[model samples]
Target: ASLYEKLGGAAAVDLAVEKFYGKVLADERVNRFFVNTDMAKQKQHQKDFMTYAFGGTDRFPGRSMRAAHQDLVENAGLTDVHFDAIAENLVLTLQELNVSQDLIDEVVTIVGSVQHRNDVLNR
Candidate 1:
Protein backbone atom coordinates (compact mmCIF):
# COMPACT_ATOMS: atom_id res chain seq x y z
CA ALA A 1 0.00 0.00 0.00
CA SER A 2 3.07 2.24 0.07
CA LEU A 3 6.48 2.84 -1.46
CA TYR A 4 6.25 0.98 -4.77
CA GLU A 5 3.03 2.65 -5.77
CA LYS A 6 3.85 5.86 -4.00
CA LEU A 7 7.19 6.16 -5.75
CA GLY A 8 5.88 5.10 -9.19
CA GLY A 9 6.39 1.38 -9.30
CA ALA A 10 9.10 -0.71 -10.97
CA ALA A 11 10.26 2.02 -13.26
CA ALA A 12 10.97 4.44 -10.48
CA VAL A 13 12.77 1.77 -8.55
CA ASP A 14 14.83 1.04 -11.63
CA LEU A 15 15.72 4.66 -12.03
CA ALA A 16 16.58 4.96 -8.38
CA VAL A 17 18.79 1.91 -8.47
CA GLU A 18 20.33 3.03 -11.73
CA LYS A 19 21.13 6.48 -10.53
CA PHE A 20 22.10 5.26 -7.11
CA TYR A 21 24.76 3.15 -8.68
CA GLY A 22 25.75 5.90 -10.99
CA LYS A 23 26.88 7.76 -7.94
CA VAL A 24 28.26 4.66 -6.26
CA LEU A 25 30.41 3.73 -9.24
CA ALA A 26 31.59 7.26 -9.67
CA ASP A 27 32.29 7.76 -6.01
CA GLU A 28 35.87 6.87 -5.12
CA ARG A 29 35.18 4.92 -1.94
CA VAL A 30 32.65 2.22 -2.91
CA ASN A 31 33.34 1.49 -6.56
CA ARG A 32 35.66 -1.43 -6.03
CA PHE A 33 32.99 -3.85 -4.84
CA PHE A 34 30.99 -3.24 -8.00
CA VAL A 35 33.78 -2.51 -10.44
CA ASN A 36 34.13 -6.12 -11.52
CA THR A 37 30.43 -6.86 -11.44
CA ASP A 38 28.29 -7.04 -14.52
CA MET A 39 26.09 -4.11 -13.57
CA ALA A 40 23.20 -5.33 -15.68
CA LYS A 41 22.98 -8.45 -13.57
CA GLN A 42 23.66 -6.60 -10.38
CA LYS A 43 20.96 -4.07 -11.19
CA GLN A 44 18.49 -6.85 -11.84
CA HIS A 45 19.16 -8.39 -8.46
CA GLN A 46 18.98 -5.03 -6.78
CA LYS A 47 15.61 -4.30 -8.33
CA ASP A 48 14.34 -7.64 -7.10
CA PHE A 49 15.72 -6.86 -3.67
CA MET A 50 14.59 -3.27 -3.73
CA THR A 51 11.20 -4.27 -5.06
CA TYR A 52 10.71 -6.40 -1.99
CA ALA A 53 12.13 -3.58 0.06
CA PHE A 54 9.46 -1.25 -1.35
CA GLY A 55 6.72 -3.82 -0.75
CA GLY A 56 6.35 -4.30 -4.48
CA THR A 57 6.41 -8.02 -4.03
CA ASP A 58 5.09 -10.35 -1.35
CA ARG A 59 7.81 -12.93 -1.82
CA PHE A 60 11.38 -11.94 -2.42
CA PRO A 61 13.60 -14.47 -4.18
CA GLY A 62 16.75 -12.59 -3.34
CA ARG A 63 19.27 -14.32 -1.13
CA SER A 64 19.51 -13.53 2.54
CA MET A 65 21.50 -10.39 3.18
CA ARG A 66 24.33 -12.05 5.06
CA ALA A 67 24.49 -14.94 2.64
CA ALA A 68 24.77 -12.60 -0.30
CA HIS A 69 27.43 -10.43 1.28
CA GLN A 70 29.47 -13.04 3.09
CA ASP A 71 31.88 -13.53 0.22
CA LEU A 72 32.33 -9.80 -0.12
CA VAL A 73 32.80 -9.45 3.59
CA GLU A 74 35.52 -12.03 3.76
CA ASN A 75 37.19 -11.47 0.40
CA ALA A 76 36.91 -7.74 0.12
CA GLY A 77 36.95 -6.76 3.73
CA LEU A 78 33.47 -5.35 3.44
CA THR A 79 32.44 -3.28 6.42
CA ASP A 80 29.97 -0.72 7.70
CA VAL A 81 31.79 2.06 5.90
CA HIS A 82 30.98 0.53 2.53
CA PHE A 83 27.36 -0.02 3.43
CA ASP A 84 27.12 3.56 4.59
CA ALA A 85 28.17 4.73 1.14
CA ILE A 86 25.62 2.48 -0.44
CA ALA A 87 22.86 3.90 1.73
CA GLU A 88 24.01 7.42 1.18
CA ASN A 89 23.96 6.95 -2.57
CA LEU A 90 20.46 5.52 -2.30
CA VAL A 91 19.25 8.60 -0.46
CA LEU A 92 20.98 10.78 -2.99
CA THR A 93 19.15 8.97 -5.79
CA LEU A 94 15.79 9.72 -4.21
CA GLN A 95 16.69 13.36 -3.83
CA GLU A 96 17.87 13.53 -7.42
CA LEU A 97 14.53 12.07 -8.46
CA ASN A 98 12.75 14.72 -6.45
CA VAL A 99 11.21 12.20 -4.12
CA SER A 100 9.68 13.75 -1.05
CA GLN A 101 11.60 13.78 2.20
CA ASP A 102 9.01 11.68 4.00
CA LEU A 103 9.08 9.00 1.35
CA ILE A 104 12.84 9.06 1.34
CA ASP A 105 12.84 8.71 5.10
CA GLU A 106 10.39 5.83 4.90
CA VAL A 107 12.59 4.09 2.38
CA VAL A 108 15.57 4.61 4.62
CA THR A 109 13.65 3.23 7.59
CA ILE A 110 12.98 -0.01 5.76
CA VAL A 111 16.62 -0.35 4.77
CA GLY A 112 17.93 0.97 8.08
CA SER A 113 16.03 -1.43 10.32
CA VAL A 114 17.88 -3.57 12.84
CA GLN A 115 16.95 -6.71 10.92
CA HIS A 116 18.76 -5.34 7.88
CA ARG A 117 21.55 -3.85 9.96
CA ASN A 118 22.85 -7.09 11.44
CA ASP A 119 22.06 -9.14 8.38
CA VAL A 120 24.12 -6.95 6.09
CA LEU A 121 26.77 -6.32 8.68
CA ASN A 122 26.80 -10.04 9.45
CA ARG A 123 26.63 -9.16 13.08
Candidate 2:
Protein backbone atom coordinates (compact mmCIF):
# COMPACT_ATOMS: atom_id res chain seq x y z
CA ALA A 1 0.00 0.00 0.00
CA SER A 2 1.06 3.56 -0.61
CA LEU A 3 2.19 5.69 2.31
CA TYR A 4 -1.00 7.70 1.98
CA GLU A 5 -3.03 4.53 2.22
CA LYS A 6 -1.16 3.52 5.32
CA LEU A 7 -1.75 6.98 6.72
CA GLY A 8 -5.45 6.51 6.03
CA GLY A 9 -5.48 8.60 2.85
CA ALA A 10 -7.71 11.66 2.61
CA ALA A 11 -9.53 11.21 5.90
CA ALA A 12 -6.36 10.99 7.96
CA VAL A 13 -4.69 13.82 6.11
CA ASP A 14 -7.72 16.01 6.74
CA LEU A 15 -7.73 15.17 10.41
CA ALA A 16 -4.00 15.75 10.75
CA VAL A 17 -4.16 19.13 9.04
CA GLU A 18 -7.06 20.23 11.21
CA LYS A 19 -5.23 19.28 14.39
CA PHE A 20 -1.96 20.59 13.02
CA TYR A 21 -3.43 24.01 12.36
CA GLY A 22 -5.00 24.07 15.79
CA LYS A 23 -1.51 23.89 17.23
CA VAL A 24 -0.05 26.21 14.59
CA LEU A 25 -2.55 28.98 15.12
CA ALA A 26 -1.94 28.87 18.85
CA ASP A 27 1.84 28.99 18.57
CA GLU A 28 3.04 32.57 18.68
CA ARG A 29 6.25 31.59 16.98
CA VAL A 30 4.59 30.66 13.69
CA ASN A 31 1.03 31.76 14.06
CA ARG A 32 1.87 35.16 12.70
CA PHE A 33 2.23 33.71 9.21
CA PHE A 34 -1.35 32.58 9.20
CA VAL A 35 -2.82 35.78 10.49
CA ASN A 36 -5.52 37.22 8.25
CA THR A 37 -5.45 34.11 6.11
CA ASP A 38 -8.50 32.05 5.22
CA MET A 39 -7.91 28.98 7.34
CA ALA A 40 -10.74 26.90 5.89
CA LYS A 41 -9.20 27.13 2.43
CA GLN A 42 -5.70 26.73 3.78
CA LYS A 43 -6.69 23.58 5.60
CA GLN A 44 -8.02 22.04 2.41
CA HIS A 45 -4.91 23.07 0.55
CA GLN A 46 -2.69 21.52 3.19
CA LYS A 47 -4.62 18.29 3.18
CA ASP A 48 -4.40 17.99 -0.59
CA PHE A 49 -0.72 18.88 -0.59
CA MET A 50 0.19 16.39 2.15
CA THR A 51 -1.94 13.68 0.61
CA TYR A 52 -0.12 14.07 -2.71
CA ALA A 53 3.25 14.12 -1.02
CA PHE A 54 2.51 10.92 0.84
CA GLY A 55 1.78 8.94 -2.32
CA GLY A 56 -1.92 9.58 -2.60
CA THR A 57 -3.96 10.15 -5.73
CA ASP A 58 -4.89 13.72 -4.95
CA ARG A 59 -2.69 16.47 -6.38
CA PHE A 60 -1.92 20.01 -5.26
CA PRO A 61 -2.43 22.74 -7.84
CA GLY A 62 -1.42 25.64 -5.67
CA ARG A 63 1.34 28.12 -6.22
CA SER A 64 4.92 26.97 -6.12
CA MET A 65 6.30 26.78 -2.64
CA ARG A 66 8.55 29.74 -3.28
CA ALA A 67 5.70 31.79 -4.66
CA ALA A 68 3.32 30.69 -1.99
CA HIS A 69 5.56 31.74 0.90
CA GLN A 70 7.50 34.62 -0.59
CA ASP A 71 5.49 37.22 1.30
CA LEU A 72 6.00 35.41 4.58
CA VAL A 73 9.72 34.98 4.01
CA GLU A 74 10.38 38.50 2.86
CA ASN A 75 7.92 40.67 4.75
CA ALA A 76 7.07 38.67 7.82
CA GLY A 77 10.68 37.70 8.53
CA LEU A 78 9.98 34.02 8.26
CA THR A 79 13.09 31.97 8.87
CA ASP A 80 14.31 28.56 9.87
CA VAL A 81 13.04 29.08 13.37
CA HIS A 82 9.48 29.49 12.11
CA PHE A 83 9.87 26.64 9.69
CA ASP A 84 11.18 24.39 12.45
CA ALA A 85 8.20 25.26 14.58
CA ILE A 86 5.89 24.24 11.78
CA ALA A 87 7.78 21.01 11.31
CA GLU A 88 7.67 20.29 15.01
CA ASN A 89 3.93 20.79 14.96
CA LEU A 90 3.63 18.33 12.09
CA VAL A 91 5.67 15.73 13.97
CA LEU A 92 3.55 16.14 17.06
CA THR A 93 0.37 15.93 15.01
CA LEU A 94 1.42 12.68 13.39
CA GLN A 95 2.57 11.25 16.68
CA GLU A 96 -0.75 12.14 18.23
CA LEU A 97 -2.39 10.10 15.48
CA ASN A 98 -0.14 7.18 16.48
CA VAL A 99 1.89 7.22 13.29
CA SER A 100 4.99 5.05 13.51
CA GLN A 101 8.36 6.75 13.82
CA ASP A 102 9.57 5.43 10.48
CA LEU A 103 6.60 6.86 8.66
CA ILE A 104 6.89 10.05 10.59
CA ASP A 105 10.53 10.35 9.61
CA GLU A 106 9.68 9.80 5.97
CA VAL A 107 6.88 12.35 6.08
CA VAL A 108 9.11 14.89 7.78
CA THR A 109 11.80 14.29 5.22
CA ILE A 110 9.32 14.96 2.46
CA VAL A 111 8.39 18.23 4.13
CA GLY A 112 12.08 19.10 4.57
CA SER A 113 12.61 18.62 0.87
CA VAL A 114 10.64 21.81 0.32
CA GLN A 115 12.47 23.92 2.87
CA HIS A 116 14.60 25.45 0.18
CA ARG A 117 11.58 27.36 -1.04
CA ASN A 118 11.28 28.89 2.42
CA ASP A 119 14.71 30.46 1.78
CA VAL A 120 16.72 27.98 3.83
CA LEU A 121 18.66 27.12 0.67
CA ASN A 122 18.87 28.32 -2.89
CA ARG A 123 16.30 26.79 -5.15
lDDT of each: 0.87, 0.81
Candidate 2, residues 1-123, lDDT tens digits: the string is 888888887888888999999999999998977889999999988877777778886465676667788777668887778878888898999999899998898888788657543443223
Off-target runs (Cα >4 Å) in candidate 2 are 58-60, 114-123
Clash count of each predicted structure: 0, 0
Error in Å for residue 103 of model 2: 1.1
CA RMSD for every model?
1.1, 2.1
Instruction: Report how far off residue 56 is in candidate 1 (Å).
Output: 0.9
Candidate 1 lDDT for residue 85: 80
Query: Against the true structure, what is each candidate's TM-score?
Result: 0.94, 0.89
